[PDB]
């Protein structure tokens, strides 16, 4: 009975992912992938609970680890943009393995990755399998504006976005945020204030953006980016890149992505990802204006977002696995699976 | 193609119902009912639009009325009770017509009047159709919260409520939350506040912690209330009764009800209707306490709560035609239809 389930990726996600998927009845751990960190030990003694019988595997060996131990699905925690993350697909398609990735911009990759993603889905589509993904930005954000969505007569705008500590997820996120760098080092070309329609990476509120206008059935004119530094009034401390950042010095960055659509709906999604003040606190914010008149908006403080990432991907197995073949967005699928007691 | 909608009540709510149903090219109206006002007159010209060649039928006709204009469903907003609607819920029944009521008790009414829920339960299953409701406190409260609920390994404690202005519903509604009622008025057996495990009608918090009882399979060992009067500071004028609040007379009424499981999770809901002061705004909170740990909540700051009742209904319709037979909690359905473009 138990879904056969791989950990595609190891780290400080797939680890917290497993301490969860361990506890439920309804779930048996068939695999667990590395590309280096931790290869050869137990997954349990990783993850401090007693040895469960199944090794982290090694990244070169992900094809033959799939093909034997026969996952229905993998849970890919690995890297960000459907070209990072290619080389592990293939793995899983190949195999007949169902995929959910946290990959960020899986969310919705059609228009800032359209070559790679059709590529994908094709694949997919060959194998009989299923590639969906989005993690916290699909769930926290895309799935309950969704649900509140469904409470409104007419839309003429959709305005909401994101804060999280950018120090929490490690040194290559920080770097990418542009953390420990100067207000002109922030722009510059090589730099992730580098203003151009021909930026890549594309940041998260630009997939989400996509991800809403194919749920609304609106035809997408145009999306902008709009980027701007993060600073401190203090000297604040980045474990990230280790090193105190100075008062002027980027902390972070904003990026508000605006699309405009043929039926004259507009959507604006702000994502803060910085180092935090004292009075700063993770944010998930939504407001529709239309009709119902005035806004219809809900706002959640202080979520624990690293964990409902995870809780999110879980939530979205069964159907990853049910799902159609092919590259298949979340606005294609039911509400996150519900909440029941009895899993353990 | 366009569904067969009858309007079952034509007072404040079923009068905006309305206004959206005719812009909607996805329905059609085949039938409006009152009581007594408004018989006789084109549904459109009470509305403020052009005659539609519907006439509001009389209270006494609705079965021959249903008989005749052969909807596939009624949106039942006439009173708040099993007891209160069943003579409307008959003819419905009787006639093949499936029903989604806003009577805010229907949210979950098995416990709070098992004897005339059963009775309906039976006889909808009898006439092959289907009763549905609970307006805002089915949409807003417990469908947001079962969204949200989704990205939760563990809940140990469900924590929330809403805040309505209790004098915008009209007298029937204030005299209920004890408006122009002293303190010891508030208090007594032929009051609101009456302090009885034989109270009823039972408060929307009760039906809502059973909703969420039945949403997270728990098997519910008792519910309480506690009802204390709201009071203001200073003279409150409320249209609903239609004179002043002197200082310390009840503004409305505090209820919240404590639901206790065999699992061992509490569920705590309070409403809060009342009186507005300056700084009063409609509110919905959601809460919830385990793992993910530190709370997973979401607010819904000054909610347009009369037009969102009505976009809950309209959502429901589909779902309710399609439904299986019987008295159908909206636990046992999908999230409320999602917003597309392209319905008007
Ligand atoms: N959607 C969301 O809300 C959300 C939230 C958090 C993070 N993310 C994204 O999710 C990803 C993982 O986050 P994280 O914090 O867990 O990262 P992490 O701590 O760096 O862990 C990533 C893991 O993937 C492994 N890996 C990388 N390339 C691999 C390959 N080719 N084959 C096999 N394993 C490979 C790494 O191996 P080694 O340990 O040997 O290097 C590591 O175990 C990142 O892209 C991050 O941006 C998304
Ligand atoms: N779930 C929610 O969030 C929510 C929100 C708002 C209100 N409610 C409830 O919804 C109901 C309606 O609200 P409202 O403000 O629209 O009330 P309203 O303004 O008083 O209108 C009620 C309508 O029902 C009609 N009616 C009553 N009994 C009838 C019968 N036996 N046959 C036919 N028509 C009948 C009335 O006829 P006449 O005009 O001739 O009297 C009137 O047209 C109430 O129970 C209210 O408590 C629920
Ligand atoms: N990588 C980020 C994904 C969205 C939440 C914050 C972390
Ligand atoms: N009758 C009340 C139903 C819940 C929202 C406030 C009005």
Not at 151 to 155: A, E, P, Q, T
Not at 189 to 192: R, S, T, V, Y
Not at 330 to 335: A, F, Q, R, S, Y
């Given at each position: 009975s138990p879904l056969r389930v791989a950990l595609y990726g190891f780290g400080n996600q797939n680890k917290e992912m497993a301490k969860m998927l361990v506890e439920r009845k309804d779930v048996e751990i068939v695999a667990v992938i590395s590309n280096k960190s931790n290869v050869g030990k137990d997954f349990g003694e990783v993850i401090g609970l007693?040895?469960?019988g199944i090794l982290v595997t090694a990244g070169l060996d992900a094809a033959e680890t799939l093909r034997t131990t026969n996952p229905q699905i993998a849970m890919l925690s690995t890297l960000s943009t459907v070209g990072d993350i290619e080389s592990q697909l293939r793995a899983c398609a190949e195999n007949k393995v169902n995929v959910y990735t946290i990959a960020e911009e899986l969310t919705f990759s059609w228009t800032s990755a359209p070559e790679k993603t059709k590529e994908m889905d094709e694949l997919f589509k060959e194998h009989n399998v299923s590639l969906i993904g989005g993690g916290f930005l699909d769930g926290a954000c895309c799935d309950m504006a969704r649900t509140m969505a469904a409470?409104?007569?007419?839309?003429d705008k959709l305005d909401g976005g994101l804060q999280y500590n950018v120090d929490h997820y490690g040194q290559v996120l920080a770097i990418a945020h542009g953390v420990g760098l100067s207000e002109e080092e922030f722009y510059a070309?090589?730099?992730?204030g580098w203003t151009s329609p021909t930026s890549y990476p594309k940041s998260y509120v630009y997939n989400m953006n996509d991800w809403f206008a194919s749920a609304f059935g609106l035809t997408v004119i145009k999306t902008e980016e709009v980027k701007t530094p993060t600073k401190a009034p203090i000297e604040l401390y980045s474990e990230a890149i280790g090193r105190a950042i100075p008062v002027g010095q980027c902390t972070g960055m904003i990026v508000t992505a605006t699309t405009t659509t043929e039926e004259g709906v507009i959507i604006v999604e702000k994502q803060v990802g910085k180092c935090y003040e004292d009075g700063d606190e993770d944010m998930v914010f939504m407001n529709l204006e239309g009709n119902p008149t005035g806004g219809v908006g809900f706002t959640m403080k202080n979520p624990p977002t690293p964990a409902m990432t995870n809780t999110i991907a879980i939530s979205r197995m069964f159907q990853t696995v049910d799902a159609p073949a092919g590259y298949i967005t979340?606005?294609?699928?039911?509400?996150m699976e519900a909440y029941v007691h009895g899993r353990l």
């Open positions: 007693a040895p469960q409470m409104m007569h007419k839309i070309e090589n730099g992730p979340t606005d294609k699928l039911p509400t």
